[PDB]
Structures are given as structure tokens and as C-alpha cells.
Amino acid sequence: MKFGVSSLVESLTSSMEKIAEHNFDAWEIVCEGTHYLSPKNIKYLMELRDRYEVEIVVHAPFSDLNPASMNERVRKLTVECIRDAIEGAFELDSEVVVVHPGYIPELWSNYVSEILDNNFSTLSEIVEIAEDYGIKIGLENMPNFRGVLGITPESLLEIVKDIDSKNLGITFDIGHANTAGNPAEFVEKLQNIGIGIIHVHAHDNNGYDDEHLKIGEGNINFIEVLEKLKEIGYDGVISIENKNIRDAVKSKEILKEYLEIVNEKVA
Amino acid sequence: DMKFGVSSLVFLPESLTSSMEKIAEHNFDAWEIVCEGTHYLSPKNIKYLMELRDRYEVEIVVHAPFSDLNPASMNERVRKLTVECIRDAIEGAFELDSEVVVVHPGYIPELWSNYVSEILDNNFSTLSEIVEIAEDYGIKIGLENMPNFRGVLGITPESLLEIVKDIDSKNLGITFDIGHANTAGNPAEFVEKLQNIGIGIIHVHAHDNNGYDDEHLKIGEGNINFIEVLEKLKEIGYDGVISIENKNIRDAVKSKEILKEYLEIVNEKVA
Ligand SMILES: [Mn+2]
Ligand SMILES: [Mn+2]
Ligand SMILES: [Mn+2]
Ligand SMILES: [Mn+2]
């Protein structure tokens, strides 16, 4: 069990050496904007992971991309952008790439079934690329918002369909799980999809909006959630997603305190 | 005088053939072809429409693709694909002898909530590129006001102005969507303000709702006062098409009769 930060906290050099001066076991680089996995950023990150020693997880680009689009060119562009992230991950010796499910476009709200086919198509094409590069894709459960796919474990199954691959699993977002139901009841079901939970996002909210609050500032029972993870022997990374560095560091300590309280129970 | 039209989506996602043969037997002055899915302006579709536009003496307006595209995107490739797709529509329009291509304002994604100014700049760049393409083809862009939805641009006239900025072009005006306006305010009061952007109102979408969702009901089923809207459109001398956007033909056809009836009444107000 290792703790990380999403660089989502702004430019890269501006955010990186400031994160590095703390004690996070892993960095989650989100492949967007100025943090994009360009050659320059790969080389910069490659040298940073040598001065220090940390694990890297990469978050694929997601913004203004729809894996589930009826527009074929939008789908093709989505695989192309996610290919950049997988390649960077490969170069970075990273082993996990986080990917978002798509959404139902307004024009095609009555054709949810065929929208799901689209997302499946794109995801297969992407998992195929992950297989070439020995990279695992963690499909991420989404916050409860109108039109978005993969809110529920059941809807995640409908995108995953019959994909049988040692390279497809789940990124468990605890915060998103709270907008849809009880975050502890997601663990069993998500672990039963593909290779199961291979990455975790940690943040808090009040069960309605994706607020990304500091741990404790919402109503998620994290103690209970850590229990379900320790139950399934989750050795991966718990990555923190907050609005600023200090809240993330406060989240770090608080969650490492709950891990203390968890492990002593097994006596 | 104002012409009445129907949008091709009253039949999406049917073939363009079945859609239009079904549309053809009703008596619309214009057809609005939305350049999406099976109705996309492909060589086969453009050639079919040309033949069909020679049998029926009708006017064609085209709606550019909008869906899953974002002209305001931080992602340059998404931005570029958006112009490529709109280029297709402008090119199809030109071959179809259309005067007007309808175009959508962009969207602010959650990730870039704190980049509004930069996002509008993006939408301005896209528009510039698209207007320039339009100028080469003798095509007019009708930038469409949007429904009242978090993150979407061009809901109000002043947000539309933030996309247009200083573009000085005989080829940029507004597509006035009445139903969208109703989700944001009084539809009749949009007319004056939209008429002041670029070359003014060059196309109109007519459909009804109860003031919150883009329901696309048939005229009368919501709470829009269409006499007022038509009254204000008359005052500005609007003589373009009024395009009905409904979910089915029967709604579209009855909307046509009700609006024609309302326009008759507006002419009586001139006493
Ligand atoms: Mn995510
Ligand atoms: Mn989130
Ligand atoms: Mn439209
Ligand atoms: Mn609409």
C-alpha cells in the first residue's frame, strides 16, 4: 500500500520539484495541457525519478475526447491521444495508465446501447496498444453526472463487455463512488472486472458533487473503505487528488493514520 | 416574406433517402440538413440532394456537425478536427448552393474552468478560420445561440460577442434559436441584441419548451409567445427561413401550420 499525488494541483516544473520535496511514494502525472507527455516532459520526468525514487502512474488525456462518440474521427483521435499516454508510460517504466469512460452525446441520448458499442470499440483498440507496450489500463469509475458512462460497476461491465486481457482492470475512484452510492460496496464489484482494482484515487465529498475536498471535509467513511481494500490484498497505489499541495499533504498523513488503525485490527 | 423549413433530424438516424423522400411530400420552403451521422454531407449524399433539389424547387440550409466537437477546446487537435468537420459542411453547402451554414459555439470543460478568457480566445481562433473558409465559398456562417446549460458558450448575446470579438466580415451572423433563448430568458428580447452581432439574424430555429430544457416541443406545447417573436422578427425585416426542429414529422407539420397562422395574425397587427 503506497501513497501518491495527482499533479492536478499550473505548469510542470512549477508543480513537480514542489511535490518531490515531500514524501509521496508515487506520482500520478495527468497527461493534459502543460503536463502532457511530450518528449520534453518525458525526459524531465525521467531524470526526476532518478534523483529521487518514486513510482509513476499516468492518467490518460480525457478532455474534449469521447471514446463513445458516433463520430468515428473523434474515436480515432481519442485512441491517438491515449496512445501518447501509453507510450509515455512505457518510456517512464510506469505500469498503469488511467482511462475515462465516455459520455452519451445529447444528439444520441436514445441510443445508449450503440454508444456503449463505440466505447467498447475504442477501449479494445486502446487495450491492444497497452498489450504491445506491456501496460495495464485502469478504467476509472465516473462521478454521478448526467450522461456519463461507467458511474456504476454494472455500467463499467457494459463497456468492458467480453474483453479478456491481462492488461484491463479498474482505477477505483473513491470520491466518484460517493456520488453514486456507498463507496465500500464498489470494491467487491470492481475487483471482479478484468484484472480488478489496479489503481485508486482518493478525495472527499458530500455525496452529490465531485468536490475533491481534503480527506474528512466530506462524508466518506475512509476507515471502512481501506478495510475492503486490505481485504482484497491491494498492494497498489492510493493517489490523492486535491485542489492544492497542502491539502494533499494533510490528506497524506490522515490516510496514513487510518492505515495504522486498519492494520492493528488484524491481531 | 419568411419561408418555413424543417430540420432533417425529424428523421435521424434514418437514411438520408427515406428521411428526405418522407420530407419531400410535405410542403416546406426550405430543408435544413444536419451534417451528422447518416445525414453527413458525403459525396453520395451531396449528389442525392442535388438531384432532389432539382425535382423540388426548395432552398437548402446546412447545419455543421457539432457533436463531440469543441471549437473552444484547449486540445489543439480537437480544435483542428472541429474546423475540418465544419469545413466539410461549408464545402457541401457550396455544392448544394446553400447561402447559410449553422455553427455551434464551444464549451468550457470542467478541467479548464479557470481558463475562461483563454477558452474564448480558442473559440475566436476557430471562428476566424471557419469564417475565412466561408468567405472563399460565398457562404454565410450563422453562429447559433445555445441552451441554458452550465459550461456552454453563446447562451446570451454578450457571450456570443465574446466569441466574435473584432471579426469584421460580411459572412458572419447569427442563427437565432428561439427554444434556446427561452431557456435563458424572454425569446422576443433576444432579437434586437442578436440582430446587432455581425450581419445579424440570418437563420432561425423554431421549437417550444417550458423554459428549462431544450425539449424541442411543437409550437404551442411550451410557454413561448411566438406572436411576439415573429413581431420582433418582422420589425427587423427578417426574410430568411424559419426552420422547425421537432422530433417527428406530424409535430413539424403542425408547427408549420400554427406558425403560418401566427404570422397571418402579425400582419393584422400592422393596422
Ligand atoms: Mn480521472
Ligand atoms: Mn474526479
Ligand atoms: Mn443546433
Ligand atoms: Mn436545440
From Swiss-Prot, chain B:
GO MF term set: DNA binding; zinc ion binding
Annotated family: To M.jannaschii MJ1614 and MJ0008.
Origin species: Methanocaldococcus jannaschii (strain ATCC 43067 / DSM 2661 / JAL-1 / JCM 10045 / NBRC 100440)
Protein name (Swiss-Prot/TrEMBL): Uncharacterized protein MJ1311
Highest taxon in the source lineage: Archaea
An annotated GO BP: DNA repair
Pfam families documented for this protein: AP_endonuc_2
PANTHER family: HYDROXYPYRUVATE ISOMERASE, XYLOSE ISOMERASE-LIKE TIM BARREL DOMAIN-CONTAINING PROTEIN
